[PDB]
């Protein structure tokens, strides 16, 4: 008379999780609000 | 006399998950508000 | 007389998920709001 | 007597999915609100 | 007297889903909102 | 013995010029690449 | 005896010129890549 | 015997420029690369 | 004998020049690489 | 026997220019590279 139950609420085996956030909100490149030249 | 349930709410094996974002928002090149040149 | 149940609400195995996002929102040319050249 | 009820609610096996998105938003050109030249 | 039921509500085996999105939205090109040249 | 002479190239008097651009390249409405709903 | 000559190359007297660009390659609006909902 | 040449190569009287250039590749509205809701 | 010349090559009387850039590359509006909800 | 002359290679009255960038690459909003929420 065996039971054997194995109701674990969250199993998980063998999970890889890789979450990868790059360049989010930079700026690699110029940023110029204002040129201004040869203004007389 | 057995059981043997395995009633796990949520079983996961070798579950492999990548998010990746690159690039978001990000300015790689260039932004110029203005650019006035030879201007009298 | 056995059982043998295996009733996990949610069963994955061997799930591999690949999320991507890359350039959202990104700028990687010029965006410039005014050229202005040679008004006099 | 046996029983060997299967019922996982959701069962998956050997699932792959690839979410891509790229260039969502994103400028790889040029965008100039004015070009004005040559004014008098 | 063996029952062997397979119930599972949903049953997915080897199911391979790509989702692509590319270029939604974005700019590969130039947008001018004026050019404006020779005048007096 | 007058002469009087008003040769000037281009002669402008109470010009009034206005260029306007809206909407040009711009989205105020939604795009959406893909909706997948309700796959099995 | 007098002259009188008035050659200005360019005469301009009173000019307004507006150059006005607004939402040029601007989104104002939802641009979505992918939506997907309920995948199994 | 008087003379009175006036060639100034341009001559500008009460010019008034106005070059405005609002939301160009600006987001005022949500951007999402991906939304993935429900996926099992 | 009076001569009288007023040759100034450029002549600027009363000018207003008024260059305004708002809202160039800004983001005033979620930008969101990817949204992930209920993914098991 | 006057002469007179006003050669000014440049001549400037009452010029008033205004250059004025605001939100040039600036975020007002949010930008999120991933949100990930409710992943088992």
Tied chains: 1, 2, 3, 4, 5, 6, 7, 8, 9, 10.
Aim: aromatic share 10%; no cysteine.
């Amino acid at each position: 008379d065996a039971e054997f139950r194995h109701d674990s609420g969250y199993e998980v085996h063998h999970q890889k999780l890789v979450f990868f956030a790059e360049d989010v909100g930079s700026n690699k490149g110029a940023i110029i609000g204002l040129m201004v030249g040869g203004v007389v």
